[model samples]
Structure formats: structure tokens, C-alpha cells
Target: VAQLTQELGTAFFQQQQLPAAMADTFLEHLCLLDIDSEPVAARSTSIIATIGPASRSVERLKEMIKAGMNIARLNFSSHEYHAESIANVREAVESFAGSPLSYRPVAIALDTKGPVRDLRFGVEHGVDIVFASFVRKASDVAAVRAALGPEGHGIKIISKIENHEGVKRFDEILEVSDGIMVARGDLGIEIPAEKVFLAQKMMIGRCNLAGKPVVCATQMLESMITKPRPTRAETSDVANAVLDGADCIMLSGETAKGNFPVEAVKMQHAIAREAEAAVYHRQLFEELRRAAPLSRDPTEVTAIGAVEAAFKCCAAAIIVLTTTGRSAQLLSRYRPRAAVIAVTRSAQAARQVHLCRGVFPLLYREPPEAIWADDVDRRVQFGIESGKLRGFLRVGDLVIVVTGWRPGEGYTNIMRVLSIS
Candidate 1:
């Protein structure tokens, strides 16, 4: 009688409380649940807020930043006083003070609503990323890159998928682009609205496997433009994007011209927090690992190993030393329960990583050490220290570290488990 009752209760727990596929990993799911009680770690999903008349002021930008705005997006679709807007965003970020709880580097992204002529201006002003609108093919991305030239090579390009053709040739488009955005605004116009959800899921899934970030954008909180609170449907839309494994959730006019810009950002942040907590990471990780193709690249394998170690050891964070942000992006592909801290010397690389889910980019600003080994050591230490300050790690917490064998790009092969002190 006792054994039967235990079996019945266990079955109910698996079927009712958790997904059936998560049956074997219920313990890890429980670990995630326990985390919700204290909620010290920052939200893994990053938010990209648009800047316009409503949010252009340094004071307003600072307020939005404090409200969980990770990236500042400028819409070129409205090309009025555009140059000052860019300057204002930079000044706001530069002048804003950061507290331990609210301090994070704010990346600037220029949205090319029509053309790439102003793209040069963005590059000159040190824009961290660009959203190439109406992207249809791989060549579209290559064309943007060509316009960027060698000098702007450091700037990342995120192709916006908004049309039927873009959806049809998405595989090729994903190849040449740094990342992608599911621009449902025009996508719904071009295709059946019901089909848009499937396209979004498929695109996000493909990007996840490819280790590229995918942004879910448009009408996330349309009513929030005037209303102080988002509608239930709008809330569901935002939460669904997070559940679909989108790397970043974006705002369009919600912050640009919205009456309650700060409130919209705050609402998005709250919805993302709730959705992220519900992610079935253990099952997702296992399925993603299984779906991953057999890889010959050393760095790719190392990333997989690091994430695997993180899950097994219940590591607090996966600290990766990266030059191109590839290592951190790859780690994000696996969707581990722990945060991925990407420590990079390049500022643009740090900002570009915000597009990837679960990756927290930290710029190592110290001058490079003469010795390569010494430089690697300092960056790793810096990552740990930053993680501690950000509340992602505590003393005696376990962390997995990934570093390169030689210097330069694509040499990341080493992975080590460290006990944080």
C-alpha cells in the first residue's frame, strides 16, 4: 500500500508539476525552483529598448537603464535630429552612474529602416551593433558588410527577418549574419498571422543551434505606448518569446514614443523574469546536446564540455575568456541553467554578446599583459570578480572556465572547473 501511494505521488509530480520529458531531471528542475525563492542572479534574457523623443534625454535614458535596459536601440525609420540622438545616447551611457545592482554596459544599436548611408555614421561614432532591416538573402548581409568596410568590421550586424522571402531563405541568411530578429510587424503583414508564430519558433530554434542570438521584436507591448500597464495578450507575447528561447526581447515605439517608456521596460523585465524561471533548461539542454552535430572544431567541443560540466557540477556560472565572443555564444547555445560570463578585451565584442541568451558580457579594460599566459589569468580573475559583484557567484561556488590554447581567435580548447573563493 505504501509503495503504491509513493508511485502514484511520483507520477502525479511528473505529469502535473513538470513536463514528462523532464522526468529524469526533476532534481535539477527543483534546483531551479529553489533559486526563485531568493532571486539574486540577474535575468538571463537581455532587453533592447528603443530610444526616441520620449527616451532621448540623458536623464530618461538613465532611468530606462536603471529599469533593466541592456541595449539602446535607435530607430532610423524616423530620421529627424538623428545625429544628436546618437550623441545623446552615448552621453547618457557615459554620464550615467551605476550602482552594484543596476550597473551594466549599455550597447548602442542602429536600426537601418531604409538604407545603409547612415551606417557609416554609426560606425564612425562607435555604434556597437546594427540591425539591417528588410534583409532577404545572404548577399543582403554581405552587402551591409561591404558598406561597413574594413574599419567597421568590428561592428556586429543583426539581420531583421520581416518578410516571406527572408523566412524562406532563412538558412542562408543565418549563415552570413551575426544574428537575426523576428520582426513580426511586417512578417504578419506578409504571411498569415497564425504562421508567424511557427516561423518565430523555427527561426529561434535554428539560431540557437547555430550559436547565434535571435531577437524577438515588434508589438511586444503596443498598448504600452499610452497605457501604463501592458495588456494580458501583450504580456503573453513577451513571455512566449522568452519561452521560445529568444536571445533578446526588443521594444519598438514602446520606449521611443511611448508615454510610459520606463514602465514598459519595467514590465518587459518583469515578464521576462517570470518566463525565464519557467524554462525547462534540463530537458532543453539534453535535447540541444543530442541535436548538436558532431563537431571537429576544438572551441566548439570545449564549449559543449564546459556547459556539460556546469550542469553536472551545478556551477553558478560559466566564465569564458573570448576574443570574438564566439566561445560565449557557443556556450549560450546549450542553454545551461547557469549564467555565461564572457570576459573580452574588445568593447564591441562585449556589447555584441548581449544578443545571446544567458551571456553577460564584461569588458576587460586593463592594459594587456606582455605575457599571453598572464593576460589570460587576469581576464579569468576579472570575470570571477565581476561575477561576484553581479551576484552571479558567491564564495565556494563552483564555476566552469573556458580559455584559449594559443592567443588570438578560434583557439579556445581549454576548460577547467574552479571553486570560487
Candidate 2:
């Protein structure tokens, strides 16, 4: 059956700029961005592309990798799966220079539609994230956690909200899970299709407030599976997801069973950039900061101050030195216009931080220095160098840096405005 098509208004194409008060607050010295300048700003919203028979080959994976696919999702519910494809993904990741510091490594996410026993393979292969489908309550995640056991400590669990019961008890699930995925396909089937958008907005808003990553998935480019170009409605759908403040937008059947897998990812990437540019970053940041609970936490306070500094200075990027990725997550909570370059010594931390919006995690390969100050400078320099290599930073640009006062965790109190000479 052909679905009926609907048209909307100019609100989709309307230009929404930063408020005057907020716009005037930026320092003129650092805010030298020109409207006509080449738009080289990197995409902050990550794209998760599902890997299926059409896109599972190592060569195809490499092409998808180069085409802006961030997380490689493997869905078990797509009928019988093979272990070799999982191994193929791993091999494909290794195909890329094979160094964590060279380029941003693609993260592996396992999506399951079943119970505890289904996660053993992922754990053994050291997957970065897991999507637990049909999560009805907080207890559901707790059971999954229990099954992950001790060896699975490094893996993160993302609850996929699919059914009406899950939507009804979303808050508790959000509290317990590391992140959330809005699997709109099953959700649309469970509830009235007319109200699916309402549920998506509510779930994404709550996840944003909670400072956890949320993914908008399914049918993002369904038509693109057959045609190289997506329908106008599909383009609007993807753009709206970015505007809704989702940390990531996912491609399911578009990448899994599509003929134009690479083109679909390219289309999603372009839509995300356009949507991100249309967002009122300053207003959004201010509201999020005001909504934050009153706290004396040095890290929390420091994070808030850093984002504010970034806005006022018009800093190109906020470089945060994080050991456990908390510092980066805290900075992303406020949603600054600038990218957050999160430099960490742990590969796991680098991969995990991909879930946070605008946080670009970089692995610091060098050994830590004996002195705390020396180590801090090394990591900060690494971030700056990486940003420069990635084109997010240029010589003489201003950068807001965050680091811990001490050598260990929970001490992220220091903040500095450094010039990228």
C-alpha cells in the first residue's frame, strides 16, 4: 500500500538566529567567523549505520566508514546472523590505519531483541555499546546489567524504547540506562502512528535534560534504500531529529538492506549539518544551564563555566581532559556551539564518549608524565593538535580547556582560555 503524503509550512525552512543579547555577548576579537566563509565545521551529531548483507563486506564497511558512519550497528533481529560479519566489522575497523590516535575509530554497537544470554558474544568480542530492545522498566536494564556480569564492565547499555509500556515508564529507564534509542518502527506499531512524533520529542527532551545520549532510529531514509535520493518528507524527518537535540541519528534499513548505502549516509550527514546550523545554540545553552540543579560540585560548576566561556569567547572548541569521560559529558550537558574535544588516555573512554553530543574523543597515546602539570599540558596539546589536524582549530584561534586539579578522577576543577598558537 502506498502511504499518503502530507506537506507542511515555511517553519521547516525558517531562519532562526541567536538572540540579540546572546549574539552581542560574544567577544569580537575571537568571533571572526564570516557568513560567506567556507562552512568547514565538522558534524557534531554522530550517525549510526546498521550493517546487513548489503553493507557488511569489509570493503563496504570501509566505504561507509569514510562516508561518515560513526557507529556500526549490528542488529540480531534481522533474522539469522553470522559471526563472520561481526568479525568482518572488526577487521574493517582494523583496516583503517589501525591506530586510535590517527583517526576517529568507528564504534561497534550490538542491538538485541532478546534476553541476557544474547550478549555473551558481544562481550567476548569487546563491543563498545549494546542496545537492549523493548525495555519496559528500570528493572529490565538492571537484569541486563546483571547478565553483563563483571567482565562486561567496559561495555555500555543503551535501552531501546519500542513499546507503549516502555514509553509509559521512560523516566525510570532513563535513570538506569547509559543511553536510549527511539526505535520508532516497533513503537509506531505499538502505539497509534499519529502520536509517534509526540513520543519521540518527549523521550529525546527527557534524555537531553538527563545529560544522556539519545538516538533517533528507523525509517530515517526508508525510500533511499531503493532510490539514491530520499523523499522530501524523509529529508525533513532527519533534519527534525537533529533539531530535536538528539545526540545521534541512525540509519536502519537504509544502510542494512539498501542499494545506495553509502549515498544514504551521505544524505543523512548533509541533512544533519543543515539542521544543526539552524538551531539556536545560545538560547538552548542558556535554558539548559538555568534548568541545571543547584550544585557545588567542582566538576559540574567547572563544566558550566567552561561552556559559558566558550560562548563568550566564541572559542573554536572546548578541549576537556577526561580520564573517565565525565568531564566531557558534563561539558556537553550545556550544549555549547563549539565542539568539545575530549582527550583521554583510555581507548574505552574515547569510544564511549562518542555517545555525547559535540564531544570528539581523541586517544592520547603517549605515556603520562610524572608531574601533574606536565601531563596536563601534554594532553591539552594533544587535543589542540588533533583539532588542528581535523580542521576544527586553526592557529591563533581561542580554545577553552578543562582539566582536573589533581592527577586522578573527580577533580576536574581547572579551566583555561588558551590561544592556539
Candidate 3:
């Protein structure tokens, strides 16, 4: 535990430009996973992994985590909610048991299936572009609202605006959704590229006003899918998104199926970090608060409060107990620098949070009924034993546990900040 604490302290201080020993102590911790935990390698905050055939097994999940996969994303575009897939991912996270490194569950992000659009023909040599219409019926809107579930109040849903109808109904969609994304490729096919650009700016402005976590995605790094470096336009586009106050930026084919997955990750990380640092802190905080829900729901309020407290205290990670992954989503909306681990008994929930920013999901079986003691301690102990609390955590590390006060009560949401020791 002392060794792990030292490693975490060194890494933390190193990020803040403080003097930390350049010795084998911390490097040995990463060496156990065959990774170089040097300052250069540890600069990035989040590492995302897509769960698939190549990365579904417990062994592979462990390997990915050791290789710096801080976040695992289950692409809703690929697989339905398969029990077997969820089990494989969950079991892999559970495998961190008895290891020096701690693990977190995968965050389950329920990505909405936006209206499909028609594609344009590819150009023979030059840049080929296509467009599609964003069609939606009242029923379609209802279906989307239903899929969001009851806890959807403040939780962000990136409504992919790809067509004319989508843009037209943008206000209505924003009313029910947490955010919006101007998926330009399909939008360009349906609308003019210039119109799409205007719509993108409008969507960004509205989301910023609403204080939602908006993401600019699709082809932001198209060239990076094939090359290690991004094109000039792609670089400018990402920078513009950052300047527009996008809460997060996404990579689709680039990171998931690109030839340079690791390099893509590195490049995105660099750009986002630099852009984020350039923003005014006060303005950023104000915008974040504006986007946050003014909710009276006890569960939502508690979760948000805990996240706020964690960020203020610089806590290492926020641990949330979620059966349906609601608490995790609420916490992620704040975009805290600290990592979030969604602990759930449901494998489906664990697999759903894959695409969410700044969230890690850990799967666990339902605990035995406790008659005389607090079950939270057991959960914390399991967290430590699994190594999710290692390297960046220690015996005295502070943890904020968000859970219920009673088994069936909804208003029983509570947050407890306990020292690990």
C-alpha cells in the first residue's frame, strides 16, 4: 500500500510540475504491466478502449488496462445488449482482484440510434462528400424519450443532428435531450456544407447556453484513421470545437478501427488538453454550472454534490453505486478531472457506459446481506484489493462513495467521504 501510495503521489505531483523522484519505484509499478510509467507516457488523463472480439476476454481487458486503457467503451453501433459480452467485460474487470493495481467498472453509455441518412457517392480522387436528412416523427421522438428512462432529467444525451428535420426540431430535441451533435458528414449530404457549419455553431452556442456537455464528432480526425498525423483542416476543426466550448470531442473510426489507434489517442489527448488549458477557468466553471440541472431529485442532487466536492478536494476518484448507470451519467456531466468508477451488479449497465467521457465501470455481484455492519466498507475493501485504488490511491486516499440509505427508498441517496486507512 505504501509503495502504491508513493507511485500515485509521484505521478500526481509530476503532472503538476512538482519535483518527484525519477527512480525505479514508480516505474516498477508500471513495469509490472509492461508499460513505461514515465512522465511522458503518463501525461494523458483518459484512455478509451472499444470492447470487441479482440478485446472481450478478461485476459484482454486486463492487458488493455495495463496498457493504459483507463476507459472502456462499448460501441452501441456494433452490438446490442448481449449478456455474454457484458459478462466477459465484467469478469475481466473483476479479475483485478488480488492484484496490486485497482480496477473500475466500464461506464455504460446508452448511445441513441439517430435517424439513418442516405450516403453520397465517393469521389474518384478528390474529397468526396455526402449528405442526409434528419427525419423524425412524433413517435420517433417519443421512442427516444422512452429509451432515456426516468432518470434522464439532467443526464446528457447527444442528439445526433444529421438532417433537415433534426435541425428544424433542434429546439424540441434540446428540450428533452442533454446535448446535441452536428454530425456533419450526414448533415452535409442532406444540407449544404455551409449550412451544416452554421447549424454546428448554433448547436454549440445553444448547448453552451444550456450548460450541457456537447461533443463534436465524426471525421474530426478522418485522415488520422490512415495516417499518424491529422490534416490541417482536421486540426483547425478540433481547435474550433474546443474554442466553441465543446465539453468533449469524440473519435469514431479513427480510434476504434483506425490503423493508428494509439497514435490517434495520443493526438486527440494532446489537442484537447492544450485547448482545455487555454480556456479561462472562471468562465469554464460558470458554463459547467449553467449546464448542470437545477434538480430537486435527491439522487441526482446527491450525485452532483459529491462530484462537486470531489473536484474541489482533488479526490482521486468518485465511486458510484449504480444498478441502471444513472448516477454515473450524472457525475460525468460535470467533467471532473478525477476519474469515476461506476460500480454495478448489472453487466448490461457495465457495458453501456463505454462511450461516456471520464467514466470507468467496474462490475460486481450483489453483495451478501449485511445485518450488523455497513456494507460500504466491504465495497471499499474490494476496490482496494482490486488495484483500482492503486498507483493513484493509497491507505489514506480519500474516496467519495455514493449509495442509498435504504434498500428501496429513492430519497436515501447519500455521499460519504472516507479515508482508506
Candidate 4:
């Protein structure tokens, strides 16, 4: 997991352009959960809400879900306090009750002085993702993974690209980490404000290119902390991030200490929905589909092969069923146009995929010795029955279902094209 591949180093510059609109359509599915959470659709971007004095209650946590909060982020910046915060955050995420297509669990993540101890400890304490703030290189992330120390793959590391040093070393950082964040606060302190948007765009693109989930943070709606609404400029910033293909948008003060946490979250969610409507994000895959690192492992090649197949034929969604989050992440890295639905039986498996781009995790009700295909059919039928895939799916849509016969290890023997109708 620590080794770098040629594909990682060279693919970003392999410039092929994406069309304004795809000649086709495709969607995806995923299974196999880790702690537990993304969007309204398997395709839409996710929303993240911060935890603090103002919005840590179980009720506030549930309200944020109505306001479109997908993940619960904690500021472990203060260290030891993360102890209590961890317990509180666990309960807050338990309040998530929106959307059944994906579990929509508020994946818990935090940024702190050290990602290793905090992250591994978070793994023990119930945190799903760890933010690698002030990270300057991939090794910074590798070090975090190292601390997770084998059997810790379920704990995801999110490298925060803030400083200039970080941008310069992002190639490695993105490779080893589960996700990336364009943390604009200290970043703005480093570069001029005039270029911050560019920096945010650049970082988000880099993460997308790398097939990693990226979150845009810092002052997205800075005014919403005090005011009921956002400034025109803040509104634009949030929408622009979505147009740029951010997997998730984060709220800090506006949700943590703000006077109107719910209002801020609602505004950001609305802006993202509008921007996603405008962008028609299929182009995200047009360029990166060719870069799935065929050299390192066969799993990637198979995952990409399934993605390309779905794209060429216009499958509604690709379903990945597995135990580790790796199966979905492998496909997510390519940023295929298909909606990636990860189906998992375990709580931790679902949470682990929270940082994966375009991967929506669903908690399926699995009974031992049940017919596999029948189980899939029943749950997805429930997804339709529950009005889960509301906007994009219908009774007769085709979905690409990809999974392994076995749960763990390198296994993806099953690949079937199924229809919703």
C-alpha cells in the first residue's frame, strides 16, 4: 500500500479532454461497509457538518441530515478533548435518518496534530476517517497508514492540502490517503485570496484525477455564522466547488459555532444541488478512466474494465459488493460516470467508503445462506420502494452489478448486468 506506481506519477498530465456531455449514461453500486455514509443519489456529491458546542446534540445532528449533512467532522485540533468529542460524535452520527439507497451514515472524521494515534484510536473509539492536516507529502499519509499498522486498512486517512508544501507533495499524499481536503483557512494565509479559488479548483481536480474524494472547506458561507444567509460571493464559492466536482462540501464555523447552523447547511446543500444540475458531471470519467494503474494489481484493471463496460453500454448504476472498502475505491479512483453503489453488511465497511468519490454505500439486510441474487433483488427493490433512488432511477432502468463471490481478499469473481424493471 505504500509503494507508488507509474500511473500515479504520469496520469495527471495525460491530457485528453472530456466532452461537454457524454454520448451515453451509466451508474454503479457498492457493498461491503466499514464504519458507515454520501448523497441524495448514488451520484450526487456529499455534505459534511462539523461538530462543536452549538451542533453536537442528537437532535441537531438529525436536523443537519434534513439540511443535507452527509458526514460529521470533528476538530481534533485540540487533542485530548477528542476523547469526549469522539463519544459525542458517535451518538450524533447515529441520528442520521435520511436516504436508504446509501446508509447515509454521518462518517466521522477529524483533523488534528497527529493522524496516526488519533486515527487508530478513532478506529477504536468509533471515528471512521482521520484528517491529515499540515501534511506536506504522501509519506505523511503513509506514516498515518503505517500507524494503522496492518488490519487498520478500515481506518481512512484524509490528507488536508493547505500549505504550498502540501500542493507540491500532493501526488504522494493523494496516493496513500483515502481522501483529500482543500482546507482554505491556513491555505489562504499562505497564498493570496485572489488565487485561493484557483488553488481550491486545482486541488479538487488533482484529487479527482487521482480518483480520491475531495472536500472543499473554510469560509464557504462565512457570513452564515452570524447572518441567516450567505453573501453573494460565498454562495458562488460553494456552487463553484460543486461545479468543479467536489465529492463533498464542508461547513466549519457556520455549523459548529454559528447562530444558524441549520440555515448554513441548508444553503450549502441547495447551492450544491443547483451546481450539480448545471455541471452534468460525466466528464469526470472521460479523462481518468484510462489511468486505473493496470501495472500494480489486477483488481484495478477488473474494476476499470467493469466501469468502461458500464460506460460504453450506459448502465444505470454499478453495484460493488465486498467486505473491504477496496472494491469500491478501486472503481471510484477512475471517476467513471456510473453511480457507484457500495453494498456492505457491516457498519464499518459502509463508513470506510465515505471518502470515496462517487461511491454510495448501502447497508443490505443479509441473512446467512440466502440466495445471493435474490437478496440483491429484494434490497434494491426496497430501494425503489422506499423512494431511495428518486431522481435518476425508474422501475425499468438497467444497473451494472459487480461483486465477488467471496467477501475478503482479492476476489471479484461475480460480474452481472441487471435491470431494475
Candidate 1 residue-wise lDDT, 196-230, digit = tens: 99999999999988878899998999998989988
Q: Candidate 1: deviation at residue 221, Å?
A: 1.5
The per-residue C-alpha lDDT of model 2 at residue 350 equals 80
Question: Once model 1 is optimally superposed onto the true structure by TM-score, how far is the C-alpha of residue 372 displaced, in angstroms?
Answer: 3.4
Cα shift from native, residue 421, model 4 (Å) = 3.7
Instruction: Compose the digit string of candidate 3's lDDT tens values, residues 43-117.
Output: 223444444455556675565555555445445443334345555655775676544234444332333334421
Q: After superposition, how far is residue 135 of candidate 4 from its true place, in Å?
A: 1.2
Q: lDDT value for candidate 3?
A: 0.55
Q: Write down the worst ten-residue block by lDDT for model 1.
A: 12-21
Model 4: per-residue Cα lDDT over 314-368, one tens digit each: 5557777756778888887765555777777777777767667567676665474
Q: Model 3: which ten-residue window has the lowest total lDDT? A: 120-129
The TM-scores of all predictions, comma-separated, are: 0.88, 0.89, 0.64, 0.78
Residue 415, candidate 1: C-alpha displacement in angstroms: 1.5
lDDT (10s digit) by residue, model 2, range 309-387: 9877667899999888999999987887778999988877887888888888887788879998998998898888888
Once fitted onto the true fold, the runs of candidate 2 whose alpha carbons sit more than 4 angstroms away are: 1-39, 78-82, 98-101
Q: For model 4, what is the C-alpha lDDT against the true structure?
A: 0.68
Clashing residue pairs, backbone N/CA/C < 3 A, model 2: none
How much lDDT does candidate 2 score?
0.82
